[PDB]
Tab-separated table of N, CA and C in Angstrom:
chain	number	residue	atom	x	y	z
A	1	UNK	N	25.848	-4.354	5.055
A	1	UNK	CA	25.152	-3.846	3.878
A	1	UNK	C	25.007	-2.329	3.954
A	2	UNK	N	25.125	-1.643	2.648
A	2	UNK	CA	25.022	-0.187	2.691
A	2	UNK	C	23.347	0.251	3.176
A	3	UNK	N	23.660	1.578	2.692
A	3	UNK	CA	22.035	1.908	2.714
A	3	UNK	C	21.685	2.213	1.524
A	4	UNK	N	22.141	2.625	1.015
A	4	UNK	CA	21.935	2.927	-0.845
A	4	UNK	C	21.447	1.251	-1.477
A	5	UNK	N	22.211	0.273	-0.590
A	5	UNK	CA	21.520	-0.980	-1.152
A	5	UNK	C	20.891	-1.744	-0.542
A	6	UNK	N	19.987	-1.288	0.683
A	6	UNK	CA	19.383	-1.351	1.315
A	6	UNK	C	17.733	-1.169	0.515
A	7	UNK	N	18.733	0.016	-0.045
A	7	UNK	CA	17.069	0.860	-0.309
A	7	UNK	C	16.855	0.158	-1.743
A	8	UNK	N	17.799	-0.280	-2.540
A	8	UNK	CA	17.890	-0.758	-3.641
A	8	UNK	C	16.682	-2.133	-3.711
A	9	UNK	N	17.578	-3.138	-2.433
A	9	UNK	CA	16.732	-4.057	-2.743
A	9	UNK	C	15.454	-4.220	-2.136
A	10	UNK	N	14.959	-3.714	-0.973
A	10	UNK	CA	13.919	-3.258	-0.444
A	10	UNK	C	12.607	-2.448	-1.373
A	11	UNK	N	13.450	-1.880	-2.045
A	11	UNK	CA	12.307	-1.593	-3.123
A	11	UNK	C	12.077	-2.557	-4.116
A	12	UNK	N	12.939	-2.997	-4.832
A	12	UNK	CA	12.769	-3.818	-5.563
A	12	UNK	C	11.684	-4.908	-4.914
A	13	UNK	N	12.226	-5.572	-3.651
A	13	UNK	CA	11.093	-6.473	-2.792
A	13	UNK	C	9.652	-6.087	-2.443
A	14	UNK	N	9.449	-4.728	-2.637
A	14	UNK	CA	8.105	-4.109	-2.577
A	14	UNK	C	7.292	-4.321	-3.344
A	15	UNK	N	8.174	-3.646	-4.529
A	15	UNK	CA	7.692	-3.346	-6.065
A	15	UNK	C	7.395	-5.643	-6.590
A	16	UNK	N	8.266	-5.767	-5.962
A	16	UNK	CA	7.716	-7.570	-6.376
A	16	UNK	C	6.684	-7.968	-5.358
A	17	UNK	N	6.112	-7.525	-4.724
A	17	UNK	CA	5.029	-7.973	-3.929
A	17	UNK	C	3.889	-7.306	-4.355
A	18	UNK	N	3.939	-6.361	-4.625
A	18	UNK	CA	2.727	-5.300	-5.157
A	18	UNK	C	2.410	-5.952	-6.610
A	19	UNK	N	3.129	-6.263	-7.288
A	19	UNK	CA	3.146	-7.045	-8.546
A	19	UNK	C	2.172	-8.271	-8.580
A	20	UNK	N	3.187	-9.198	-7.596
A	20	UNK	CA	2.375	-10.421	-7.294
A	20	UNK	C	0.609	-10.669	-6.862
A	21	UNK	N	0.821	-9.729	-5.879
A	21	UNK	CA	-0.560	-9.566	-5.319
A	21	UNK	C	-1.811	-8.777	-6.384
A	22	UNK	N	-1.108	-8.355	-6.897
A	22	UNK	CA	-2.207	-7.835	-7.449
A	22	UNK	C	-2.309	-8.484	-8.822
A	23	UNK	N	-1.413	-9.441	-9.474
A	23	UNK	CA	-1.591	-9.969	-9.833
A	23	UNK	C	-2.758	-11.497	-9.934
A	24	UNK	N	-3.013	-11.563	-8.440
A	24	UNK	CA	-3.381	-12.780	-7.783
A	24	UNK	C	-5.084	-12.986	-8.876
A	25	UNK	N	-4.321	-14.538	-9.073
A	25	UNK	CA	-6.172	-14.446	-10.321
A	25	UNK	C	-6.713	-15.522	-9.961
A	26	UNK	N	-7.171	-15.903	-8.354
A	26	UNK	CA	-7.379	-17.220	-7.106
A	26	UNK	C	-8.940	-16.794	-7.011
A	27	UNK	N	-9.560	-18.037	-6.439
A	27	UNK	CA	-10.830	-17.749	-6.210
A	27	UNK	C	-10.819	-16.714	-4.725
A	28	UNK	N	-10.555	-16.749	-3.859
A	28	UNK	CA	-9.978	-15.939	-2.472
A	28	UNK	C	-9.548	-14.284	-3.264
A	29	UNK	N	-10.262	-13.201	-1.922
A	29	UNK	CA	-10.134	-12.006	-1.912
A	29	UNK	C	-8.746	-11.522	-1.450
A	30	UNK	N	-7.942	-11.084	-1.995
A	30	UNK	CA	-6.866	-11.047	-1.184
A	30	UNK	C	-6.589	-9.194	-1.787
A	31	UNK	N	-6.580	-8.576	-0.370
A	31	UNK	CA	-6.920	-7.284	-0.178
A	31	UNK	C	-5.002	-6.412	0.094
A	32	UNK	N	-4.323	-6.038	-0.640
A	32	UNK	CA	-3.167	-5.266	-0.338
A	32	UNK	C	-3.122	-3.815	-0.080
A	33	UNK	N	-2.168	-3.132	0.312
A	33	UNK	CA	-2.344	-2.033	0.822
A	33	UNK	C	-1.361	-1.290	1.090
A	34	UNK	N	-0.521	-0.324	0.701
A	34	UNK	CA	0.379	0.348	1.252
A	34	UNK	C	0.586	2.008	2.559
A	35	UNK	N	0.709	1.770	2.985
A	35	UNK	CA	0.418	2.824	4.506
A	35	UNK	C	1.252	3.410	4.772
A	36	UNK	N	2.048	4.037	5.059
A	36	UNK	CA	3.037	4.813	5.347
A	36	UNK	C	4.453	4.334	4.730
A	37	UNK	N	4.484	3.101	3.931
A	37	UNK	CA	5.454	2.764	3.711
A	37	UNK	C	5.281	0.948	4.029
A	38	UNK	N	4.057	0.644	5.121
A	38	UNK	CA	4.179	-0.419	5.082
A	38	UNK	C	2.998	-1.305	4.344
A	39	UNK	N	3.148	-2.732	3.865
A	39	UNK	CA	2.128	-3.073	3.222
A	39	UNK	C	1.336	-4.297	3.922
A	40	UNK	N	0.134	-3.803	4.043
A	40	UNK	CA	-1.137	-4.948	4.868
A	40	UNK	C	-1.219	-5.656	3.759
A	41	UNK	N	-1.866	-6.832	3.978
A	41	UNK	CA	-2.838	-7.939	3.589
A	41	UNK	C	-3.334	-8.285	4.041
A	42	UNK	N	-4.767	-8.065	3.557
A	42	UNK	CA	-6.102	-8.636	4.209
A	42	UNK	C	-6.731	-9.717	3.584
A	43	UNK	N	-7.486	-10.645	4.629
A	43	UNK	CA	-7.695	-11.836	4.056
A	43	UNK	C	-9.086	-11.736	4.129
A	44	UNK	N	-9.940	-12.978	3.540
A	44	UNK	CA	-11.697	-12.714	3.568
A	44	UNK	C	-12.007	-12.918	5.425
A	45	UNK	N	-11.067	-14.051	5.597
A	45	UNK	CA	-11.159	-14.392	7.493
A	45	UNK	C	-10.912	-12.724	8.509
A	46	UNK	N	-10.749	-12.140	7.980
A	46	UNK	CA	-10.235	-11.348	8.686
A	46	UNK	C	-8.374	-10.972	8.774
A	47	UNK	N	-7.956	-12.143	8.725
A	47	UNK	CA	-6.584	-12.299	9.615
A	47	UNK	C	-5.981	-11.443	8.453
A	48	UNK	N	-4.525	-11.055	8.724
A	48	UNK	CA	-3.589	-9.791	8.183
A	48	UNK	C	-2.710	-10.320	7.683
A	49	UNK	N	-1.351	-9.953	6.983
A	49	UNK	CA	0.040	-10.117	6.732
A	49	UNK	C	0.445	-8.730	7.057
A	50	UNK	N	1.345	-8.350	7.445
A	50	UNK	CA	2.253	-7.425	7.121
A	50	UNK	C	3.623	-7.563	7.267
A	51	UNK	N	4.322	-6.257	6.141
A	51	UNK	CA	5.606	-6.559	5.760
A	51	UNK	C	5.732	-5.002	6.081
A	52	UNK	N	7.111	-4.809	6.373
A	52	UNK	CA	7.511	-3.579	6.747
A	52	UNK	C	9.126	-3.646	7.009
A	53	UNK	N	9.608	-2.378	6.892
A	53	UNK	CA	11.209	-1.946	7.143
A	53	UNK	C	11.850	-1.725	8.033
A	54	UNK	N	12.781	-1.765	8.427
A	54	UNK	CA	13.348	-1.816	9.500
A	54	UNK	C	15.211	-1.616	9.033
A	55	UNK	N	14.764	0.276	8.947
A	55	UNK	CA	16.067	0.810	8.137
A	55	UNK	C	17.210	0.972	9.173
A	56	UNK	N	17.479	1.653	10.159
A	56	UNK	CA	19.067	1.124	11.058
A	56	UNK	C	19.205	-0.268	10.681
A	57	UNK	N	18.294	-1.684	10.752
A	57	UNK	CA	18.808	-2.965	10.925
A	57	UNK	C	19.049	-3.520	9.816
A	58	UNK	N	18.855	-2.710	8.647
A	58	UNK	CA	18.484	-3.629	6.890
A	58	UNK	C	17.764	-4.690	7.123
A	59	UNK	N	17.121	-4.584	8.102
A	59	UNK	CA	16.208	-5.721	7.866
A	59	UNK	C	14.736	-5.499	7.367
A	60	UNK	N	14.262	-6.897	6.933
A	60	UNK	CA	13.101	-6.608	6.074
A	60	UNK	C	11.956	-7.235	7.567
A	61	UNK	N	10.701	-7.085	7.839
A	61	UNK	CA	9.934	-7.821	8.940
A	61	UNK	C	8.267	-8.192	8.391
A	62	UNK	N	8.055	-9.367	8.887
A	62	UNK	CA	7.124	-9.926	8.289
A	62	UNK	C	6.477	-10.520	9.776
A	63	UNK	N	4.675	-10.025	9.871
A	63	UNK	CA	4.349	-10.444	10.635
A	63	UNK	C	2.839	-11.013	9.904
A	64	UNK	N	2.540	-12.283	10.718
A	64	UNK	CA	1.538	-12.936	10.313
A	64	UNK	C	0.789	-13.411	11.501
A	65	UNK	N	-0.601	-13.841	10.974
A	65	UNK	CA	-1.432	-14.843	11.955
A	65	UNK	C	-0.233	-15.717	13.147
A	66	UNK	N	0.473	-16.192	12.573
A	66	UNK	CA	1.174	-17.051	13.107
A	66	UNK	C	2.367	-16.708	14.686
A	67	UNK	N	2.976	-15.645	13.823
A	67	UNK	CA	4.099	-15.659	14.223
A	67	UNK	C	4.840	-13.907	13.561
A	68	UNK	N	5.917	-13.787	13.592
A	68	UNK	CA	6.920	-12.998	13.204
A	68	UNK	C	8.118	-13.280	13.244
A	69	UNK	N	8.961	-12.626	12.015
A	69	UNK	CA	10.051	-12.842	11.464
A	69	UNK	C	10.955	-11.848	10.700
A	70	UNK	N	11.944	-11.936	11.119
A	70	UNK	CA	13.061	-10.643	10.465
A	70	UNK	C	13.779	-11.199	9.556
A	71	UNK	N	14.006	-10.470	8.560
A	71	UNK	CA	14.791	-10.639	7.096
A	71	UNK	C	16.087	-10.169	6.904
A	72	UNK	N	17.130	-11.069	7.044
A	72	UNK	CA	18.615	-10.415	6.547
A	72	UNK	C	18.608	-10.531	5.170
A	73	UNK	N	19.594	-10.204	4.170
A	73	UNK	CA	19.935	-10.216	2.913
A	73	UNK	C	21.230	-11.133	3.078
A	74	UNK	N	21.141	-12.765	2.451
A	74	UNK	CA	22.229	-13.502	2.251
A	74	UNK	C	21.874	-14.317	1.144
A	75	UNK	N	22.865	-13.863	0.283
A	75	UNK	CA	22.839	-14.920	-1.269
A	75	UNK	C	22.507	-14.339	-1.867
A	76	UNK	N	21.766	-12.983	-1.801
A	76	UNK	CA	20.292	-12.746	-3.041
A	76	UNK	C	19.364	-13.440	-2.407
A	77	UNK	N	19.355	-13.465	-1.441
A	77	UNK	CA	18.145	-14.206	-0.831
A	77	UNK	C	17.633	-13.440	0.595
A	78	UNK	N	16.565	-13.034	0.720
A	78	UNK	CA	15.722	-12.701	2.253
A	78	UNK	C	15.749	-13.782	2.767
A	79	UNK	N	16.613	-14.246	3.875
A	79	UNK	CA	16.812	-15.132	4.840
A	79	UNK	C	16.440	-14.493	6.230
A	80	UNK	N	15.337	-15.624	7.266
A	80	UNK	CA	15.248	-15.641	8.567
A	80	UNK	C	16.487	-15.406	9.490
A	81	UNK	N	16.626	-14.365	10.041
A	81	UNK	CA	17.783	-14.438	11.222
A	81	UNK	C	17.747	-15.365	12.480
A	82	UNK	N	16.362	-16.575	12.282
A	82	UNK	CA	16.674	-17.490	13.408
A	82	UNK	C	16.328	-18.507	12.958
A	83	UNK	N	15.529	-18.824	11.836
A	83	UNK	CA	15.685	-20.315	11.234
A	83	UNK	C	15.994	-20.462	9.729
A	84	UNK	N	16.752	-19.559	8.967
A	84	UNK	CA	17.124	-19.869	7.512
A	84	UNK	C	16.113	-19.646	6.585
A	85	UNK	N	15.174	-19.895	6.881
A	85	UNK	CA	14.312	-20.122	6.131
A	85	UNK	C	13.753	-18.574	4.805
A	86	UNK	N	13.927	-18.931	3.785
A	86	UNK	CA	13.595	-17.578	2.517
A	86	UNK	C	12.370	-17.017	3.022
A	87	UNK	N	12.074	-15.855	2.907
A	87	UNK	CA	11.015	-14.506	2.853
A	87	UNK	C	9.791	-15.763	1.718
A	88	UNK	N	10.539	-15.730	0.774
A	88	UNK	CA	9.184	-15.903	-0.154
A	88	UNK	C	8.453	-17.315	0.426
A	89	UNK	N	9.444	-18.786	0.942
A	89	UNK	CA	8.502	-19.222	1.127
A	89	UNK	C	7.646	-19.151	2.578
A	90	UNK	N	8.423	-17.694	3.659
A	90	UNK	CA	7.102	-18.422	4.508
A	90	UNK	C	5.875	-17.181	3.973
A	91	UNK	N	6.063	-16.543	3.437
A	91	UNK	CA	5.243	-15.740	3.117
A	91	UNK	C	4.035	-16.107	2.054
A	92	UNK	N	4.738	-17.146	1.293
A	92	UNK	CA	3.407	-18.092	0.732
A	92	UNK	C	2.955	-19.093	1.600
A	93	UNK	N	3.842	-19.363	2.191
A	93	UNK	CA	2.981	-20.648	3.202
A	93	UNK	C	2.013	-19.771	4.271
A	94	UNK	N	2.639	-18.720	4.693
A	94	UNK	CA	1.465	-18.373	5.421
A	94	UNK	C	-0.037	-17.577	4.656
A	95	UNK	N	0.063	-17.156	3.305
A	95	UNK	CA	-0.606	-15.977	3.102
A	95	UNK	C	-1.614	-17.990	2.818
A	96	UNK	N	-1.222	-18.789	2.230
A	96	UNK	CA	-2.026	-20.184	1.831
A	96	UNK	C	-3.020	-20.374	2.992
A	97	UNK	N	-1.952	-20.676	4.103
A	97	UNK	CA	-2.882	-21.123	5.290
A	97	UNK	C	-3.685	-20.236	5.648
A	98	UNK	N	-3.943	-18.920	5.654
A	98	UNK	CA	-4.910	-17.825	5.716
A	98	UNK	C	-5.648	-17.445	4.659
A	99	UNK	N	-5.218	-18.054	3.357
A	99	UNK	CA	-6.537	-17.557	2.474
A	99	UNK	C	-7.303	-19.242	2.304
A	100	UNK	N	-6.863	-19.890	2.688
A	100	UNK	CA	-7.569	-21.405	2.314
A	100	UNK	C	-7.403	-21.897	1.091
A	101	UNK	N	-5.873	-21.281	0.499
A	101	UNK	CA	-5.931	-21.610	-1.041
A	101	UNK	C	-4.886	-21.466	-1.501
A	102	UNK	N	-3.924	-21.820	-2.051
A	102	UNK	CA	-2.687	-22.187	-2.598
A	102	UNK	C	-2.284	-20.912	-3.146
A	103	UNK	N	-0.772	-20.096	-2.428
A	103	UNK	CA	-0.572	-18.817	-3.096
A	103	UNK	C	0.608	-19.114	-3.060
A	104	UNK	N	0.731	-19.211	-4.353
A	104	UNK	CA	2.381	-19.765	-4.771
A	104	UNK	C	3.004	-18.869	-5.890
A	105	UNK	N	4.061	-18.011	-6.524
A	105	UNK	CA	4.377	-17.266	-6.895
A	105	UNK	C	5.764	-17.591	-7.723
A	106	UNK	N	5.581	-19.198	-8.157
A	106	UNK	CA	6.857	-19.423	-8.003
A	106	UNK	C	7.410	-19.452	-10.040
């Protein structure tokens, strides 16, 4: 992948998260944030999300309560580089299990 479309869809993936979230109209506080480039989520528990770049690798990185995970670009799709699995759904499954409440975007 280039970097010109790197940056293409990386923004675009920003600009759709900043959307979403602040869109969010849930009984749960759900707190976003952009920092140097990267974006927190804060939950009422305390616990975090963050998403951030990772420009030599085109990869996109997502770390949670749980775990962490790196993002290739295959299909039009943010795919896991070790279990397949799409950006969007573990990123709703996890932001759910940390806000105690169904965050689905779909």
């Amino acid at each position: 992948m280039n970097d010109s479309e790197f940056h293409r869809l990386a923004d675009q993936l920003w600009l759709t998260i900043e959307e979403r979230l602040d869109d969010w109209d849930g009984d749960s506080d759900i707190d976003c944030e952009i920092n140097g480039g990267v974006l927190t989520i804060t939950f009422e528990n305390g616990s975090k999300i963050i998403i951030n770049r990772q420009e030599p690798l085109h990869q996109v990185w997502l770390a949670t309560k749980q775990g962490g995970y790196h993002f290739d670009l295959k299909g039009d799709e943010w795919i896991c580089d070790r279990s397949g699995e799409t950006f969007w759904d573990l990123l709703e499954q996890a932001a759910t299990q940390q806000a105690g409440e169904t965050v689905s975007f779909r």
